[PDB]
Amino acid sequence: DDIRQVYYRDKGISHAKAGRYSQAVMLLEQVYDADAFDVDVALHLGIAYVKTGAVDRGTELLERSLADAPDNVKVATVLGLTYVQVQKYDLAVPLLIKVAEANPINFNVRFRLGVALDNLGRFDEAIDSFKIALGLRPNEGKVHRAIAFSYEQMGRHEEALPHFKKANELDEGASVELALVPR
Ligand SMILES: [Mg+2]
Numbered sequence: 001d002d003i004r005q006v007y008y009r010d011k012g013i014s015h016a017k018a019g020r021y022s023q024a025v026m027l028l029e030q031v032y033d034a035d036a037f038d039v040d041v042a043l044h045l046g047i048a049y050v051k052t053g054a055v056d057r058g059t060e061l062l063e064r065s066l067a068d069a070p071d072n073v074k075v076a077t078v079l080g081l082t083y084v085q086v087q088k089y090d091l092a093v094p095l096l097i098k099v100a101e102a103n104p105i106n107f108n109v110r111f112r113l114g115v116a117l118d119n120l121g122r123f124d125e126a127i128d129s130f131k132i133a134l135g136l137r138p139n140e141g142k143v144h145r146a147i148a149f150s151y152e153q154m155g156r157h158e159e160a161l162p163h164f165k166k167a168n169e170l171d172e173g174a175s176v177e178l179a180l181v182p183r
Contacts (some may be wrong), residue, residue, distance in 0.1 A: 016044035043107040126150045141170035
């Protein structure tokens with residue numbers, strides 16, 4: 001266990017990458033060290049803790065990791081998305097804002113940001129994120145539906161309506177209009 005410690009590190013990270021998160025916890029717990037901080041071990045063990053229900057230990061390792069490596073978009077993403085999931089929206093929002101700007105092709109982040117903003121009552125900001133998300137994925141019914149709800153809350157029924165109708169059209173399946181549009 002310098003050699004054994006390298007074995008558990010590499011194997012543990014391997015497991016975390018693969019989604020074998022229980023096993024990743026069992027192995028990376030043997031190598032993690034708060035006071036000789038290794039951000040790859042802490043990030044992957046943080047993820048694995050969050051995925052196995054140890055959300056408080058996980059968000060701890062991830063805050064520590066993000067304090068150590070403020071550049072780490074991977075770390076900021078899982079921490080932001082985790083906070084969204086546990087509904088700590090005051091924490092989630094600034095992380096997701098910063099990740100969305102660092103990584104503008106990440107649709108899930110932009111959507112989840114818009115959903116959070118909507119749930120805080122920041123309907124204008126939500127609408128702005130949902131429009132960005134639709135620019136990434138124009139045929140995601142769930143975004144058309146989310147943005148229609150935000151417009152409606154602001155009394156913008158005229159603007160909501162086309163998005164409502166699109167959401168319901170996409171639920172059924174294919175838009176017949178595309179029969180007439182060249183590719
Ligand atoms: Mg709402």
